[PDB]
Symmetry: D3
Subunit: 276 residues, 6 copies
């Protein structure tokens, strides 16, 4: 039958089903190729967490007699899932991505989990030692948003290093959505890195962050190489913006709410002008 909305719907469909111009500058994606799945990617990052921090994300109840069994099953599930997503990435943006290539890259990534665990361990320690409000390594790994963002970042960075396209950005934007912390997979970040609270933090594509660095909520390391360099032991407080070819010397402190466009000598402190 024909209702008053019937022809409105059919006409809408006809218009939506064409667009010779809305073929956009969209290059051609081969039919049959799989597309990145946010769902699969979510599962991938969660398995990575469960493998890196066994028993915390790796099991609902504590059981020392099954830690290894779970690592074994989790690594296999991750391998299958990651192979497919890496294949989707290669296909997105001779070379007609065969699973063979994707499966080896996925295995290469997995071989990096022990190292990722070692690095993330220092990040958790830095988060604990410098946060009186933190009262356990377990509480930090279990619910602190910063560890999740940093974990996603290090996972994405490794994938980028291995040459997996698209997937790395997908993974960091995922953390961006869940934590409000936006770290570009290309950023370079040292050990014992910590982000306090973190909502609004933005770390640009070519940023270089040293060791034992701490950033607070709203801190931006951006531009407009062209991103800032923060040396070791640096602290940047709430909402400060650092942009361009700027180097924050080791041990320096950057007060909050300031637009920083000049180098900051090591061990110095820079704060906003007085208000009245």
């Amino acid at each position: 039958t024909t209702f008053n909305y019937t022809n409105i719907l059919t006409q809408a469909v006809d218009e939506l089903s064409e667009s010779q111009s809305y073929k956009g500058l969209f290059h051609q994606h081969k039919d049959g190729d799989p597309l990145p799945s946010a769902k699969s990617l979510y599962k991938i990052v969660e398995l990575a967490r469960a493998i890196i921090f066994p028993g915390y994300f790796g099991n609902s109840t504590v059981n020392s007699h099954t830690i290894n069994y779970h690592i074994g099953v989790n690594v296999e599930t991750l391998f299958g899932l990651l192979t497919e997503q890496i294949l989707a990435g290669l296909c997105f943006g001779d070379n007609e991505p065969c699973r063979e290539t994707a499966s080896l890259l996925a295995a290469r990534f997995i071989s990096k989990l022990p190292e990722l665990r070692r690095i993330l361990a220092t990040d958790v320690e830095a988060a604990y030692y410098g946060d009186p409000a933190a009262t356990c390594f377990g509480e930090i790994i279990s619910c602190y948003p910063a560890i999740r963002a940093i974990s996603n970042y290090r996972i994405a960075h490794e994938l980028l290093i291995l040459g997996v396209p698209l997937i790395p950005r997908f993974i960091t934007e995922m953390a961006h959505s869940e934590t409000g912390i936006d770290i570009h997979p290309g950023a370079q970040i040292g050990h014992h890195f910590t982000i306090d609270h973190g909502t609004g933090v933005v770390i640009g594509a070519t940023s270089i962050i040293g060791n034992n660095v701490k950033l607070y909520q709203g801190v931006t390391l951006g531009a407009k190489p062209r991103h800032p360099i923060l040396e070791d032991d640096v602290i940047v407080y709430s909402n400060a913006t650092i942009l361009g070819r700027v180097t924050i010397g080791k041990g320096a402190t950057v007060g909050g709410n300031i637009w920083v466009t000049e180098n900051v000598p090591a061990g110095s402190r820079i704060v906003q002008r007085k208000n009245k």
Copy 2:
């Protein structure tokens, strides 16, 4: 049986099940009326995305031979879902909202999808052309949070224009939660709009934004008409606050971390005072 917690629970229930005062200034909602469903609304926005960007949210694998089939099925699912939610909105806040009224409004909205696609297309282009870190239209549509917030906004705005109450705000707050970007459905926003990173962005109810405007994370366009006006080609950097009857002239640049309460002449640049 009676445990030590038994009477505590029953007494709690008795107290919670009364409140003659907690009938609040809550007007009376008719029994039988459906209430807005965040779940249905989520599905609605996702279908809208899949219809606006066919094959990106419209299918898990690439298949040019089924794009139209999916648009047809998706439009129908959206129509059914949207009719019910619009009905819930009308019922929330002679006129005893009949589905008949809601179904036509839902169809009217759908007839606007081709235009929404045209506008959003310019937003994606602006996001690509001004972001060296962006490397594909596909990557932008697929995982950039800004496009999701802007999409939700334009969808909500149209619904507001059509006179659908409550639902528009529901939709923007949804993006607010998922991206950290808060745009009031009543704001007016031009073509080629882009938000870089975006967490913390706040765009007030009566804001007017021109064409080719770019906002960074933490930027607020608020007050306390009474919201700012940004002319074409304006850029507002990280965490800047613009409030009141303020006009940012075309081509002007607003540095970050500044409280702007005065008009900004066209083509000029305003930055925070030096620090030391």
Copy 3:
């Protein structure tokens, strides 16, 4: 069979399944003990909402004839779920946490829901009366992110007061993720509290906030007792940072984008220095 990735995977598992050093400073968690479940905790907070605001989160359709039935069922579901999570908290960080202890604490919490409803009611009123963009108590409770964060906070605070470890922080970080609003469960907050927009708001562990206080997006109440004290009727605009032993006098107004490290007299106004 042996593929090229086979031995890579097995070697990865072997390395991941040891770590005598990665036993970390992680104290020993007893085998058999349940661990906190973000999933159960999500259900817990949602039930709390449905009980505090009956019919809004308590039912998909309006029905005055079943409000009490739903409160009864919801209180029971909450009780079961909360008992288990409280038990997990006690076990995390003579005293070998018996469900008996956890069940009474869970019941004690539930007996506080009537009071929580009374307090939250004032928060909703404050959100309505001071937000021209707000047009109904129902719209506020239903989709405003601030009410969700404040609700989670008051729920977590009560749990903290009752002596439930870990779970309170879990609950606030949950709101942190969903709204971008980070309130430490230990903060003390008065009636008629409101947060406008809120993404990026950070309220430190020992902060004390009076009655009728309003905070905007990006506002930080932190440090580095050692957290700020805001007296009644205070307003802090966008992105302002207040840190240390600072007291904001009643009725005072703190402009946005400023680093505040000094006391602010009552009824006064402090704004950022002019820009040029």
Copy 4:
């Protein structure tokens, strides 16, 4: 792109999307009308069970303090679901089925639950008292397939009596699938009815079964009024077939594996001829 299977798929779709003859003797179903949902129907029968046998299907844990709350919530959920399905039935096969008609029928059905509980109670008693293998009323209600089939039947019969088309048969076939027991909704069955084991039992549309009757697996009451009549206290053993205008007198016993086409006097016994 075009693969070897591409044109095969498109041609298949073209052929499947026509059929002027396969419009069959299928009468025309109005666009917009809802169709019966096996999913909703499953939920409906489960709620009916939970309401008829409170606490058995009505709650995962025993709690005398919430039985009534659950009955209240369950009745409401059932009402909503049943209204829609009854509407679908009326629409399937002036009279353009308005929910108004369906909602009252749904309420009428619900008003019959107390009586259904009374009748089913006698069926459970008969199942217990005549089954030495049965050791509790609770075990019978909880997992005996016969009670489920008989429950579905009595539910469907009442719906048939009220004039709800299609839905009754849907409900009995549901039990048919789950238990192997096929009872036509039109059959008439007395109190204290029991089916032992039951797989393969078939009870025809116009069958009339008295009180305290017991049937075993594979028993058929069919034909080809034209279905059998079983008086009180009758027992029919395994796989026996009773067809046509046949009356099994009260207290009679029908042995298994026999084709019965003649009346069976009351109190008599009929068995298969000897084998050798």
Copy 5:
């Protein structure tokens, strides 16, 4: 820690994780190969139904304007799913099954759906015309178990014909479980086939059934070529067993509850000996 059940569990695992003998006569299944998924197979059969009977299983609400869209989407989903399962079948029991082979077979099957629809249409007609209890083609397709079993059978038979191993039996056993009707995929069955009630029906691997044949519940066509042949217009009543090299002549009737091991002349009737 070590509980009293700890070592019992570990010892159980050790014993279960070996078995050099329980490598059974199980041939070696290549690592990496996918195994048949009952879950995917369920989805496959449901999509086949929705495509064969458009709008009945193809949509929750009636909509003539979207029938074709749904057929298009459903055919694609089916194609993807069926390709994988066929690949699993080939792998189960030079020839190292490439998806290429499986995808073409899957497409070949799909090209048979129009014909399957034509045949099944006659089965539905036979079910209606010979069942006074049937009152609509729609009611039959929608909930009659026989149509589901017969549909699964014809689907499985075609797959068998195309040379797909394992999957066909999987599909018929699926119907066997859901309806109590067991038809071997190798059986040959003519048009206008109908099964009344059907629980307990068993149709052997090499059975040949003519046109317009009707079988009742519990009927077995088995053995121990070596299975029965039923010519056109044959009817076999409840629980009758036909085995071996037996031919039931056209138009013949086989009464219920009888062990038939001899040929049955055309147009004749054979019934169980009298009882007393």
Copy 6:
């Protein structure tokens, strides 16, 4: 508001929420006790299958490198689930069932899985060797309904032997529903047992079945010790009923469709009288 169905619903609830008589002969179930969960029980049986037949139900893809990992994880999941259900059984029908008792019984059951695997292995072999239609051990374990019923039975029997009440019957009725095969947990069944097709098979509580016995669909071993005894190498064809104190001698064959109430000498054959 008050609709025409409003008071009908409230009155129904009032009537349903009382019943001093419908407290039935239902003994009192302690508040707080968990009730048997068909859902948990389903998971339990599926895990048991995956552990008994590793890689068949134990993983979606073939992987010899992870068989043991999966057995380890599966045994743990099963242990947790089974402990709770056994506790529910003990509570159903001094002795106030403590999890301590249930956990040891659950572990005791698990220690029996290696033996169950050994016995079931003979059942699979018997199903293969005597079924020309069977073409692989893998096909049998993967989709043959008989193996599922027999597996559930042996699992339930062991639980019965260990003294777990209620749960065993729950488990067999589960198989009864899924396969149409009803085996009482108390039956005693020898090795190399096979059921061909099986729908309608009924094996009574005190039945004793020897080794290498085969039963066909519809076969009943019942009564009304008091159940039949079948010695080794016995075969009972389709729909035959054996009841009472009857012994079927070894190597004997019982034809189908016959009511057997007398002993059957070893090696003999008994068939239905001729028909005409």
